[model samples]
Target: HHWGYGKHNGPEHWHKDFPIAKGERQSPVDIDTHTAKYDPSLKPLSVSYDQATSLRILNNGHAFNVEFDDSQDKAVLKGGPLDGTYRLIQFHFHWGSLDGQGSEHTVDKKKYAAELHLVHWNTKYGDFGKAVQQPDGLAVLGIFLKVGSAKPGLQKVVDVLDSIKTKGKSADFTNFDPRGLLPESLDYWTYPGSLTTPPLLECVTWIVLKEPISVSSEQVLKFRKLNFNGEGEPEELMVDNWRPAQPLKNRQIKASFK
Candidate 1:
């Protein structure tokens, strides 16, 4: 049996197979605004990308992922709670079956329409595979999604979702700057957390932006069209894939802005 977001194999039951699911620093923790300490010491995040490094997009039976060529430092993330440079590897999303609730990390218990994760790896860790378990080995940029104006920058990605509607499907997607997808303000909340998926490694330095990017209702509905099943199997609409926020025990969340 494989891990999934269904009752039979959902997050609540992941601990039975992967013990770290109950670890100290599990991800997607709820952000309580009043409790987060504003830290002036946190540097402004610096992100630089070479649009040509974008490789392809794929549906991996989980989410639609936009992969990047991390062979070189073409797309890198630095500063803002990071000790070393991290390379951009891939980006994916988690959404609800319907609109009101889907984002993994909530602000004051209020869920958003969707969530986006920009997964990166520390250059010091050799490779992403090796970086999975080491402290400070990974850095994920979390961005919340709201229903409103359609994001022109996201249209390119949305246009290709049709080709990869089913599991194990992929298509070339290049020359697109992932930076364009980010919100104008880099102000964020920083904390240490784990991967929100199976093999749930406790190695990510999370940088979740305070602001959310907007997308049209029609645009977000496209995400629901993806299926968890492959070509011949039963089709299961890929929705409500977000993990509920875990406890924030023995940790402090720092704010990069007032």
Candidate 2:
């Protein structure tokens, strides 16, 4: 880690000089339900809880994103949650200063404590990343987090936090059904937004749920202990992993009520 230009040090300087220099299309889109339009066309997506399907663990330091096999777990569409088959690419969470105030997505000009994004791509089109480029490329389900009653679905994920306690250190996270994480209500809000990641690609249709699931206080602490060190553990301890709010631009947010 030398101090110079045109190399590793260059990026460090560039970022500081530019300030806003960061990964493109980051998450946490602001949602004003009152101002948004919930269209009848988009129906609420459905998934039956079955122990048959297996989940993939792509534990990259950022968050333990889970990938669901379409053939194994089917996402049934009802009224208009989304058209065509939207396969689950991955699901991850974002947290900030406190459990009651670190979510990426905000509702009605209000910010939540934390947020979990269930990234899904429309199979009607193609791959998850590619699908988001189009008008209907992706559908991201946003769930807010609060410090109160615990959500049983979240336990499936929190249960594995201990296994990966050491940074960059990962183990097999097993026996989990993503459907259990979803809310009982099918109603969801949809809107055209950008990816909350680098390159800030505007390739997302957000399906923000009104009712957020609850999680234990201890589970939140485990998320903050991720470390990406190359020694004992290669992952970095991530306590604050979230991007600031993004502008709405000239877009219309629609929701599905079924």
Candidate 3:
């Protein structure tokens, strides 16, 4: 059976096939500011992405993913809580079906309209697949998306939604800088967690930003237009593809800013 964000195969049922779903360091946690410790030594996040490294975008039966060429150090994330360079592999979004709250990681128990995840793999590990199982292997930068002004860079991505509407479909996407989707402030909360999807491996070093980027309400709805099923399969809306907040366990959540 395939894993999906449906009632029959969603997060609630992932543990049957992927035991890591119930791991101690699961992701998408509710960030309690009062509980987070302010770390003065945490360096500012340093992100360097070469627009040429952006290759393609695809709908992979779960979410719309914008992939990057990670063979080299063209686009890498350092500083912050990371010890070494982590190459950018891809980025994806999670949103609600009909608006309102849908973000994965919540702030002060508040959820945003959507969330974006920039997945990276530690250079020391060589490849993403290999990095996903080891501790300190993968680093995922999480950004909350709030509906407000029309984001031009975001609109560019939304415009291509129609081409890759169905699962397994893809289109060439280039000359796009992932940094355009980020906010001015790099202040973030850091913790060790697992991937939000199955096989939810306990290998991610999560860096969730404090401020949110803006996108139009209509632009967000464009994400909902993509279909979860492939052509000839029963159509299902690809919305609310987020794992609910998990337990923090014995981990200490650290803040980059006070």
Candidate 4:
């Protein structure tokens, strides 16, 4: 619970609590394009959404997440680096308080304004809880958000930020199609990794999209409005909730594009 972005409890301190924080397959590693291997075997990513699967949004003092009805395969991520179907569970964003330093996975030493994560659990491994512990259990799609022209795909969630401004607040968020949130190209880099957050389990298969979706600077500011502190606690703005890029170690970044 003390794993905040604050200096005392931020990522540098996470290893003290979760020793796995220093694991081999830790996520959010910097993707050096020059060294990435383009694998022709990698297929185009297949994203299927039912549009009405989104259920609600919650601000859990970390980042706000829009949860989905993963009870069935109404929405799932397939193909690409994945071998089987993976059900969509939730999607969340990580960003900095300022403009240029939010994104966790930097490309060629360049950081984006923010990063979005669509978390999915492999169906072969059963549910999320169980899948999270297995090596080939989860597949996460990572999308970068740059500061530029506004994107309409983001407005549906933006309009409701006020309702879930405080930590622990949740609102009824429905009928959202997450597929619209992707960029024109599904080209990506795939690798074995862990959750950027705590208990840093090394079970995630990361599919980081190469093309970034655009969002205005203003939209990023609204995300900063969500409080990390609850109603009775001292107000602390939830910003820079992203883990710094970790070491790639022995892993090779396999790209879907040249």
CA RMSD of each candidate after superposition: 0.9, 5.2, 1.1, 1.0
Candidate 3, clashing residue pairs?
none
lDDT scores in order:
0.92, 0.62, 0.90, 0.91
Per-residue C-alpha lDDT of model 3 across residues 23-46, encoded as one tens digit per residue: 789988999999999999999999
TM-scores, one per candidate = 0.98, 0.78, 0.97, 0.98
Which stretches of model 3 miss by more than 4 angstroms?
none
Candidate 3 colliding pairs, count: 0
Candidate 4, residue 101: Cα displacement in angstroms equals: 0.7
Model 2, 1-258: lDDT tens per residue?
422222343323434543333434334557777778867666556643354244555546555666566554354322345666566656788775566566777877676667888776777665665675676677777877776767777776776776755435555555677677766675677666766654446667677888877766776776676553444645456555565566566667676653
Pick by lDDT: which candidate is best? Answer: 1
Candidate 1 RMSD computed on C-alpha atoms after optimal superposition onto the true structure: 0.9
TM-score of 1: 0.98
Mark the regions of model 2 whose C-alpha exceeds 4 Å error after superposition: 1-27, 48-52, 70-81, 166-168, 228-236
- Alpha carbon lDDT of residue 196, candidate 2? 62
Superior candidate under TM-score, 1 versus 2? 1
Worst 10 residues of 3 by lDDT: 46-55
**52-161, model 4: which lDDT tens digit per residue?**
38999999889999999999768888999899999999999999888888999999989998999999999998799999889989999999999999989899999899
Candidate scoring better on TM-score of 1 and 3:
1
Choose 2 or 3, whichever is better by lDDT: 3
